[PDB]
């Protein structure tokens, strides 16, 4: 139900532009809470929660 991906590495800088987005610099390790959506995953980084593009990270 929450996808097969639990951990992922940021490939590119993602700039969060909205409150619900989880921004990161490339090389960050993201905990992936939900990977079921093909477009945007849900993650935890620095104890914050948010959405980020799935194609910006590598499992």
């Amino acid at each position: 139900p929450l996808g097969s991906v639990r951990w992922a590495r940021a490939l590119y800088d993602f700039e969060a532009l909205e409150e619900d987005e989880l921004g990161f610099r490339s090389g960050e390790v993201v905990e992936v809470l939900d990977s079921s959506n093909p477009s945007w995953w849900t993650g935890r980084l620095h104890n914050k929660l948010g959405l980020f593009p799935a194609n910006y990270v590598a499992p």
Binding site: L11, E18, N37, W40, L49, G50, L51, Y56
Partner: peptide, 12 residues
């Protein structure tokens, strides 16, 4: 870096 499409963001 890939194009970003926010039209596909699901609710958090």
């Amino acid at each position: 870096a890939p194009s970003i499409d926010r039209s596909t963001k699901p609710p958090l």
